[PDB]
């Protein structure tokens, strides 16, 4: 958003002026691709990855074929490093089964950073809240909605219903059981011994939210970030937001508007609603950068499934792009990425709708 083309130009100049002379050769096989890349990369010092890359299985299309293939294999549930933990991806908290998991996550972060450094695209992709963690950005309760609907619904219920008439007795500590461990966690020092009360709702909600992102995955995330930071230091991503970081890694595809429009569903709206006529008119005029940022804001990603918009998936299964009327023309638009849902208030004119979309697309998360 805003000056994004300026943002990446500055980044490409950063990598280019930090490059190193000479090269590193990487020998790999087709069927053993991820064991071999692991051993050849991890044997090299991190700044050696800033040199020219030579992958013998053009002399730069081999590199792209490496970054695509290895991208699929490292995020492939086989070494048990990643768990979908949605439905039909993210770090698996049961990766401790692998005694060397922390070594594999170091490699994965180094590899993701090589892709950015060398301006190559990966065909895998983490969630927006993961990219916010890479950018040291505050994680919100809406990010919670994107990872864990049912955990989100419970915290919302505590937030605006008094839990005294409910009989809720809660404390500032949460268990978690991974591989039959049952590990307690004190949200603060001595937290298991403080009752959650109507005065301290806000904090508890905030601590519970922050704890949910890194449950069973702190060590793994710390290793990923340490390895990444060794190749491309994280402070070079300083001007970017999570939506821009995703595009930089995944690349841009152009959206098929006929395919989008015929696979959209409506709640308390129709194709004959003027707010829908205006909406489809808005996306016909804007850039395709705006279209992709709008797919991000609504579905949670810029990537489109194999099949097009008909195949869109959300939480409990198939979930097509959806628009729903809420509130009044004074409200701002908002979204629920788990449901691929846009909450579009009933604005009064085309211009008001265009101004309020573009604000939500470009300025809010």
């Amino acid at each position: 958003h805003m000056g994004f083309r300026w943002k990446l130009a500055h980044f490409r100049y950063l990598c280019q002026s930090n490059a190193l002379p000479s090269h590193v050769k990487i020998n790999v096989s087709r069927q053993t691709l991820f064991e071999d890349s692991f051993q050849q990369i991890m044997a090299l010092k991190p700044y050696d990855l800033r040199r020219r890359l030579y992958v013998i299985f053009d002399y730069g299309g081999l590199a792209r074929e490496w970054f695509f293939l290895l991208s699929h294999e490292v995020l492939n549930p086989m070494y048990c490093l990643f768990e979908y933990a949605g439905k039909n991806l993210q770090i698996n908290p049961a990766s401790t089964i692998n005694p060397d998991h922390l070594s594999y996550f170091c490699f994965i972060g180094r590899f993701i950073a090589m892709a950015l450094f060398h301006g190559k695209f990966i065909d895998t992709g983490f969630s927006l809240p993961f990219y916010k963690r890479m950018l040291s950005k505050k994680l919100t309760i809406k990010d919670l909605e994107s990872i864990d609907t049912e955990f989100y619904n419970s915290l919302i219920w505590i937030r605006d219903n008094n839990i005294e008439e409910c009989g809720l007795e809660m404390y500032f500590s949460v268990d978690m059981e991974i591989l039959g461990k049952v590990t307690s966690h004190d949200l603060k020092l001595g937290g298991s011994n403080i009752l959650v009360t109507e005065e301290n709702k806000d904090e508890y909600i905030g601590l519970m939210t922050e704890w949910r992102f890194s449950r069973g995955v702190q060590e793994q995330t710390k290793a990923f970030l340490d390895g990444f930071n060794e190749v491309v230091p994280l402070q070079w991503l300083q001007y970017f937001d999570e939506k821009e970081l995703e595009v930089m890694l995944c690349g841009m595809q152009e959206v098929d508007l006929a395919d989008w429009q015929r696979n959209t569903v409506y709640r308390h709206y129709t194709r004959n609603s003027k707010q829908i006529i205006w909406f489809w008119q808005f996306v016909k005029e804007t850039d395709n950068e705006v279209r992709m940022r709008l797919l991000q804001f609504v579905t949670g990603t810029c990537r489109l499934p194999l099949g097009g918009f008909a195949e869109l998936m959300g939480s409990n299964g198939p979930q097509k792009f959806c628009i729903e009327k809420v509130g009044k023309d004074t409200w701002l638009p908002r979204s629920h990425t788990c449901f691929n849902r846009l909450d579009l208030p009933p604005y009064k004119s085309y211009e008001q709708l265009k101004e309020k979309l573009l604000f939500a697309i470009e300025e809010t998360e």
Binding site: E150, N153, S154, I158, E165, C166, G167, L168, M170
Partner: peptide, 16 residues
Amino acid sequence: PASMRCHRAAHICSVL
């Protein structure tokens, strides 16, 4: 309330 609240409180602790 036809045994309300009681079933949500049990559900909220079970989730959290």
